[PDB]
Structure formats: structure tokens, C-alpha cells
């Protein structure tokens, strides 16, 4: 549970950590187990550097397609339409 909480945090801070630092924060005892966890966490570690950049952006783009969706996103167009029918009721 500790590993998932920390994993979340470290994205918002930075994009690049060396191999050693990833292991130390998340408290793995094996460096290879570190890189393995990174794939399972859907992070690519390349040449000793994490590239948090990919998945995070991808997720937001995926979230953006759903259905609930117009009033939750809030349209400026909708603001005029809702204001009028209040008055005229």
C-alpha cells in the first residue's frame, strides 16, 4: 500500500529519477525488482531514468472520452441557456 501512495507523489514532483532513487523511496531491496515494478506501474525506465511523461498524459486524454459529460465539463454556451429559462419560468 506504501508503494502505491509514494508512486503517485513522485510524478507530480518530477519526471526524472535515477534507478537508485526509485528503489530507495519505494523501499525495494533489489534493483532488478525495481525495473520490474516500473513495468507493472506502467512506467518505462530507460537508460537509468524514468519517463513518467507518457502514461500520465495518456490517462487524461483517455478520461476526456466518457459520457456524464457535458455539465461536469461545464460549457460557457450552457451558462446563457440555463440563466434565461430561470427568469422566464
Amino acid at each position: 500500500a506504501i508503494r502505491d501512495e509514494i508512486a503517485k507523489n513522485t510524478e507530480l514532483s518530477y519526471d526524472f529519477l535515477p534507478l537508485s532513487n526509485i528503489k530507495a523511496l519505494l523501499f525495494f531491496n533489489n534493483e532488478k525488482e525495481t525495473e520490474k515494478f516500473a513495468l507493472e506501474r506502467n512506467w518505462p525506465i530507460v537508460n537509468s531514468k524514468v519517463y513518467f511523461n507518457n502514461q500520465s498524459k495518456e490517462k487524461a486524454d483517455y478520461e476526456d472520452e466518457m459520457m456524464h459529460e457535458e455539465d461536469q465539463k461545464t460549457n460557457i454556451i450552457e451558462k446563457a441557456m440555463d440563466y434565461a429559462i430561470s427568469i422566464e419560468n
Partner: protein
Amino acid sequence: DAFRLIDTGALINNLEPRQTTSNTGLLNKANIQALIHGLNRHYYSLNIDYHKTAKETKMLMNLHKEQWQSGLKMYDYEEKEESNLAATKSMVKIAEQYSKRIEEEKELTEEELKTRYVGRQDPKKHLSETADETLENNIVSVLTAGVNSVAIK
């Protein structure tokens, strides 16, 4: 106004009621003195109604080609700026009158209250009318700009 002679003969024998039989009785009685005297002693005045077909009505009623297009035409923006500024400023000056008014104006005798605290040319009401007219407009203003941008591109 429309008129039809009366005969002198009709008035002399006092036979004039014949001409005013079975009617709703609505007569225009505007214009008197010499004019009315002459009318009574010479003609009869009766109503004018206007009948028109709905074909005629529609042709007239129809306006420009650009009439049904105007909502994406919009005001020059320098004037919307001017108007926004004018309304905020004006209400401030009438708001002074309104604050003074409800200092007191809770005594008795209606007309006196209106002279003492300047309840004539009433500030609350004149303010409520201006505030709303400007408010409605500003909804229209935004509505056009957003729509123009998005529809075309």
C-alpha cells in the same frame, strides 16, 4: 373622418332619427363649435373601419433579406465597452438618492413623505429598470460572440 350629407328637409320635420336607427351608437364627437354646428345642420359623421386581406398584410409585413441574418452581425466592440462603463457609473449616482431616502421615511402622511425624502421620481424603481435592461443585454452580447467564433470555425 367620413361624412354623408343630410338633407335640410330631414331636420326641419324632425325626421332625423330615421338615419340613426339600429346601431352600436359609437360616434366620434371630437371637434365642436362652428364645425360641429355645421355637421349637425348639414352632414352625418360615421366610423371608418379598415379591412384588408391577410395576403396584403403579409407582403407589407415582410422586411429585408438581412433581417433573418442579423443575429451573427454584431455591434462594434468599442460601443459595447462604452455602454458597460456608462451603466456602472450611472447607477452609482442614483444610489446616493436611494440611501438618503431610507434614512427616515417611516413616518405618516403619504404625500409628505415623498416631498421630505424625495420619494417623488422614485430612485428604487428607476434603478431597478436600468439595472435589468443592461443585464439582459449583456447576456445577448456574450451569446453572439461565442456563437460566432464556434459556428464559423
